[PDB]
Chains A and B, each alone.
Chain A
Protein backbone atom coordinates (compact mmCIF):
# COMPACT_ATOMS: atom_id res chain seq x y z
CA UNK A 1 0.00 0.00 0.00
CA UNK A 2 3.03 2.24 0.51
CA UNK A 3 6.79 2.08 -0.12
CA UNK A 4 8.62 -1.17 -0.94
CA UNK A 5 10.56 -2.35 2.10
CA UNK A 6 7.54 -2.36 4.41
CA UNK A 7 5.50 -4.11 1.72
CA UNK A 8 8.22 -6.73 1.21
CA UNK A 9 8.61 -7.46 4.92
CA UNK A 10 4.85 -7.55 5.51
CA UNK A 11 4.28 -9.94 2.60
CA UNK A 12 7.12 -12.20 3.74
CA UNK A 13 5.96 -12.35 7.36
CA UNK A 14 2.38 -12.95 6.24
CA UNK A 15 3.49 -15.82 4.01
CA UNK A 16 5.51 -17.32 6.86
CA UNK A 17 2.57 -16.98 9.26
CA UNK A 18 0.18 -18.58 6.77
CA UNK A 19 2.57 -21.48 6.15
CA UNK A 20 3.05 -22.02 9.89
CA UNK A 21 -0.70 -21.91 10.54
CA UNK A 22 -1.47 -24.40 7.76
CA UNK A 23 1.34 -26.73 8.84
CA UNK A 24 0.05 -26.63 12.43
CA UNK A 25 -3.52 -27.26 11.26
CA UNK A 26 -2.45 -30.28 9.22
CA UNK A 27 -0.11 -31.53 11.95
CA UNK A 28 -2.33 -31.00 15.01
CA UNK A 29 -5.24 -33.24 16.03
CA UNK A 30 -7.62 -30.47 17.17
CA UNK A 31 -10.24 -30.18 14.42
CA UNK A 32 -13.50 -31.68 15.72
CA UNK A 33 -14.66 -32.11 19.31
CA UNK A 34 -17.24 -34.89 19.05
CA UNK A 35 -18.55 -38.05 20.67
CA UNK A 36 -17.20 -41.39 19.50
CA UNK A 37 -15.22 -44.49 20.35
CA UNK A 38 -11.54 -43.83 20.99
CA UNK A 39 -10.37 -47.46 20.82
CA UNK A 40 -17.77 -46.94 24.77
CA UNK A 41 -18.73 -43.60 23.21
CA UNK A 42 -17.00 -40.65 24.90
CA UNK A 43 -15.65 -37.20 24.02
CA UNK A 44 -12.78 -37.15 21.52
CA UNK A 45 -10.90 -34.47 19.59
CA UNK A 46 -10.14 -35.47 16.00
CA UNK A 47 -8.03 -34.02 13.22
CA UNK A 48 -7.06 -35.06 9.70
CA UNK A 49 -5.15 -38.28 10.47
CA UNK A 50 -6.04 -39.37 14.02
CA UNK A 51 -8.69 -38.89 16.69
CA UNK A 52 -7.31 -38.63 20.23
CA UNK A 53 -9.59 -39.49 23.13
CA UNK A 54 -10.64 -36.60 25.37
CA UNK A 55 -11.70 -37.13 29.00
CA UNK A 56 -12.27 -40.83 28.40
CA UNK A 57 -11.43 -43.90 30.47
CA UNK A 58 -8.22 -44.56 28.51
CA UNK A 59 -7.29 -40.94 27.89
CA UNK A 60 -4.69 -40.13 25.25
CA UNK A 61 -5.48 -42.98 22.84
CA UNK A 62 -4.60 -41.18 19.60
CA UNK A 63 -6.17 -43.75 17.29
CA UNK A 64 -6.08 -43.61 13.50
CA UNK A 65 -9.29 -42.53 11.78
CA UNK A 66 -11.33 -45.35 10.23
CA UNK A 67 -11.23 -43.74 6.79
CA UNK A 68 -12.35 -47.00 5.13
CA UNK A 69 -14.07 -49.10 7.81
CA UNK A 70 -14.31 -52.88 7.51
CA UNK A 71 -17.08 -55.21 8.75
CA UNK A 72 -19.76 -54.60 6.11
CA UNK A 73 -18.95 -51.05 5.05
CA UNK A 74 -21.84 -51.39 2.52
CA UNK A 75 -19.51 -50.03 -0.22
CA UNK A 76 -19.96 -46.59 -1.80
CA UNK A 77 -20.50 -44.99 -5.18
CA UNK A 78 -17.71 -43.54 -7.31
CA UNK A 79 -18.30 -40.02 -6.00
CA UNK A 80 -18.59 -41.13 -2.37
CA UNK A 81 -15.45 -43.26 -2.62
CA UNK A 82 -13.63 -40.36 -4.29
CA UNK A 83 -14.65 -38.03 -1.45
CA UNK A 84 -13.59 -40.60 1.15
CA UNK A 85 -10.20 -41.02 -0.55
CA UNK A 86 -9.71 -37.25 -0.74
CA UNK A 87 -10.54 -36.93 2.97
CA UNK A 88 -8.21 -39.80 3.91
CA UNK A 89 -5.30 -38.51 1.83
CA UNK A 90 -5.89 -34.85 2.79
CA UNK A 91 -4.48 -34.04 -0.64
CA UNK A 92 -5.94 -30.52 -0.75
CA UNK A 93 -4.67 -29.21 2.63
CA UNK A 94 -1.25 -30.65 1.75
CA UNK A 95 -1.46 -28.99 -1.67
CA UNK A 96 -2.22 -25.71 0.08
CA UNK A 97 0.79 -26.23 2.37
CA UNK A 98 3.16 -26.96 -0.52
CA UNK A 99 1.80 -24.05 -2.57
CA UNK A 100 2.38 -21.74 0.40
CA UNK A 101 5.92 -23.12 0.62
CA UNK A 102 6.44 -22.47 -3.10
CA UNK A 103 5.09 -18.94 -2.74
CA UNK A 104 7.48 -18.31 0.13
CA UNK A 105 10.31 -19.72 -1.98
CA UNK A 106 9.42 -17.37 -4.84
CA UNK A 107 9.21 -14.40 -2.47
CA UNK A 108 12.61 -15.23 -0.97
CA UNK A 109 14.14 -15.70 -4.43
CA UNK A 110 12.70 -12.34 -5.50
CA UNK A 111 15.48 -10.72 -3.45
CA UNK A 112 18.02 -12.27 -5.85
CA UNK A 113 17.83 -11.06 -9.47
CA UNK A 114 15.25 -8.34 -8.83
CA UNK A 115 15.05 -7.58 -12.57
CA UNK A 116 12.79 -10.59 -13.15
CA UNK A 117 9.29 -9.42 -12.24
CA UNK A 118 7.26 -12.51 -13.19
CA UNK A 119 8.52 -14.24 -10.04
CA UNK A 120 6.31 -12.05 -7.84
CA UNK A 121 3.36 -12.77 -10.14
CA UNK A 122 4.08 -16.49 -9.79
CA UNK A 123 4.21 -16.10 -6.01
CA UNK A 124 0.84 -14.34 -6.00
CA UNK A 125 -0.67 -17.04 -8.20
CA UNK A 126 0.72 -19.66 -5.82
CA UNK A 127 -0.80 -17.92 -2.80
CA UNK A 128 -4.22 -17.56 -4.44
CA UNK A 129 -4.17 -21.21 -5.52
CA UNK A 130 -3.16 -22.22 -1.99
CA UNK A 131 -6.16 -20.34 -0.64
CA UNK A 132 -8.43 -22.08 -3.15
CA UNK A 133 -7.00 -25.47 -2.15
CA UNK A 134 -7.60 -24.57 1.50
CA UNK A 135 -11.23 -23.78 0.64
CA UNK A 136 -11.63 -27.12 -1.14
CA UNK A 137 -10.03 -28.98 1.77
CA UNK A 138 -12.31 -27.33 4.31
CA UNK A 139 -15.37 -28.13 2.19
CA UNK A 140 -14.44 -31.79 1.67
CA UNK A 141 -13.52 -32.22 5.35
CA UNK A 142 -16.87 -30.83 6.49
CA UNK A 143 -18.74 -32.94 3.92
CA UNK A 144 -16.92 -36.09 5.05
CA UNK A 145 -17.72 -35.30 8.69
CA UNK A 146 -21.44 -35.01 7.87
CA UNK A 147 -21.99 -38.54 6.60
CA UNK A 148 -23.43 -32.29 18.78
CA UNK A 149 -19.96 -31.36 17.52
CA UNK A 150 -17.60 -28.40 17.59
CA UNK A 151 -14.48 -27.28 15.72
CA UNK A 152 -11.11 -27.09 17.46
CA UNK A 153 -8.47 -24.42 17.13
CA UNK A 154 -6.63 -26.07 14.23
CA UNK A 155 -9.67 -25.71 11.96
CA UNK A 156 -9.75 -21.99 12.71
CA UNK A 157 -5.96 -21.95 12.32
CA UNK A 158 -6.42 -23.28 8.79
CA UNK A 159 -9.16 -20.74 8.10
CA UNK A 160 -6.89 -17.92 9.29
CA UNK A 161 -4.10 -19.40 7.16
CA UNK A 162 -6.37 -19.24 4.11
CA UNK A 163 -7.33 -15.63 4.85
CA UNK A 164 -3.70 -14.59 5.39
CA UNK A 165 -2.62 -16.43 2.23
CA UNK A 166 -5.22 -14.59 0.16
CA UNK A 167 -4.15 -11.27 1.70
CA UNK A 168 -0.50 -12.01 0.93
CA UNK A 169 -1.41 -12.97 -2.64
CA UNK A 170 -3.24 -9.66 -3.04
CA UNK A 171 -0.18 -7.85 -1.70
CA UNK A 172 2.10 -9.72 -4.12
CA UNK A 173 -0.13 -8.87 -7.08
CA UNK A 174 -0.07 -5.23 -5.96
CA UNK A 175 3.74 -5.37 -5.85
CA UNK A 176 3.76 -6.80 -9.38
CA UNK A 177 1.52 -3.96 -10.60
CA UNK A 178 3.73 -1.39 -8.84
CA UNK A 179 6.88 -2.82 -10.42
CA UNK A 180 5.37 -2.84 -13.90
CA UNK A 181 4.04 0.70 -13.45
CA UNK A 182 7.51 1.86 -12.38
CA UNK A 183 9.02 0.17 -15.44
CA UNK A 184 6.47 1.88 -17.70
CA UNK A 185 7.11 5.26 -16.06
CA UNK A 186 10.89 4.95 -16.43
CA UNK A 187 10.49 3.84 -20.06
CA UNK A 188 8.16 6.75 -20.90
CA UNK A 189 10.49 9.41 -19.47
Chain B
Protein backbone atom coordinates (compact mmCIF):
# COMPACT_ATOMS: atom_id res chain seq x y z
CA UNK B 1 0.00 0.00 0.00
CA UNK B 2 3.03 2.28 0.23
CA UNK B 3 4.31 1.14 -3.17
CA UNK B 4 0.94 1.80 -4.82
CA UNK B 5 0.56 5.17 -3.06
CA UNK B 6 4.03 6.53 -3.79
CA UNK B 7 5.08 9.41 -6.04
CA UNK B 8 7.19 9.23 -8.18
CA UNK B 9 6.64 5.58 -9.16
CA UNK B 10 9.06 3.25 -7.37
CA UNK B 11 8.71 0.47 -9.97
CA UNK B 12 11.59 0.08 -12.41
CA UNK B 13 11.84 -1.11 -16.01
CA UNK B 14 14.60 -3.74 -15.79
CA UNK B 15 16.67 -5.13 -12.92
CA UNK B 16 19.78 -3.43 -14.34
CA UNK B 17 18.02 -0.05 -14.23
CA UNK B 18 16.88 -0.71 -10.67
CA UNK B 19 20.42 -1.55 -9.59
CA UNK B 20 21.73 1.56 -11.35
CA UNK B 21 19.16 3.79 -9.64
CA UNK B 22 20.08 2.15 -6.32
CA UNK B 23 23.66 3.23 -6.98
CA UNK B 24 22.37 6.68 -8.02
CA UNK B 25 20.23 7.29 -4.91
CA UNK B 26 22.97 7.22 -2.22
CA UNK B 27 20.91 5.21 0.25
CA UNK B 28 17.61 6.91 -0.59
CA UNK B 29 16.21 3.97 -2.59
CA UNK B 30 15.96 0.24 -1.90
CA UNK B 31 15.50 -2.56 -4.45
CA UNK B 32 13.40 -5.63 -3.65
CA UNK B 33 14.79 -8.42 -5.82
CA UNK B 34 15.74 -12.09 -5.86
CA UNK B 35 18.44 -13.04 -3.38
CA UNK B 36 20.71 -14.75 -5.92
CA UNK B 37 20.77 -11.72 -8.23
CA UNK B 38 21.28 -9.47 -5.19
CA UNK B 39 24.32 -11.48 -4.06
CA UNK B 40 25.69 -11.58 -7.61
CA UNK B 41 25.51 -7.79 -7.91
CA UNK B 42 26.99 -7.45 -4.41
CA UNK B 43 29.94 -9.51 -5.68
CA UNK B 44 30.74 -7.12 -8.56
CA UNK B 45 32.58 -3.83 -8.86
CA UNK B 46 32.39 -1.23 -7.45
CA UNK B 47 30.87 -3.30 -4.61
CA UNK B 48 28.69 -0.42 -3.42
CA UNK B 49 25.56 -2.54 -2.88
| Interface of A toward B, CB cutoff 8 Å | 72, 74-75
Enumerate chain A residues within 8 angstroms of B26, measured Cβ to Cβ.
Answer: 74
Interface residue? B14 (CB, 8 A) = no
- How far is it, in angstroms, between the C-alpha of A72 and the C-alpha of B28 when the chains are bound? 11
Range of interface residues on B (Cβ < 8 Å): under 10
Chain B hits for A75, CB < 8 A: 28
Closest to A73 in B: B26
Q: Is the interface of A mostly helix, strand, loop or mixed?
A: loop
Q: Is the interface of B mostly helix, strand, loop or mixed?
A: loop
B interface residues, Cβ below 8 angstroms from A: 24-26, 28
Residue of chain B at shortest CB distance from A75: B28
Min C-beta distance of B42 to chain A, whole Å: 21
Would you list the 3 A-B pairs with minimal beta carbon distance, nearest first? A74-B26, A72-B24, A74-B28
Chain B residues lying within 8 Å of A72, measured Cβ to Cβ, are 24-25
Q: How far is the CA of A74 from the CA of B29 in the complex (A)?
A: 11
Complex contacts, B24 vs chain A, CB 8 Å: 72
CA distance A75 to B25 in the complex (A): 10
C-alpha gap A88/B25 in the complex (Å): 24
A166–B28 Cα gap in the complex (Å)? Answer: 46
In the complex, the chain B residue whose C-beta lies closest to that of A72 is B24
A-B contact pairs, 6 of them (CB 8 A): A72-B24, A72-B25, A74-B25, A74-B26, A74-B28, A75-B28
Contacts of B28 in A (CB 8 A): 74-75
Give, as a whole number of angstroms, the nearest-CB distance from B47 to chain A. Answer: 19
Docked Cα-Cα span, A115 to B41, in Å, equals 80
B39 to chain A, nearest CB (A): 26
Q: In the bound complex, how far is the Cα of B21 from the Cα of A72, in angstroms?
A: 10
Residues in chain B near residue A74, CB distance under 8 A: 25-26, 28
Nearest residue (CB) in A for B27 is A74
Instruction: Tell me, rounded to whole Å, the shortest Cβ–Cβ distance linking B18 to chain A.
Output: 15
Closest chain A residue, CB of each to CB of B25 = A74
- Docked Cα-Cα span, A72 to B29, in Å, equals 12
Instruction: Give bound CA distance, A75 to B26, whole Å.
Output: 10
Give complex CA distance A72, B25 in Å.
Answer: 7
With both chains docked as a complex, state the minimum distance between the C-beta of A73 and any C-beta of chain B, in angstroms. 10
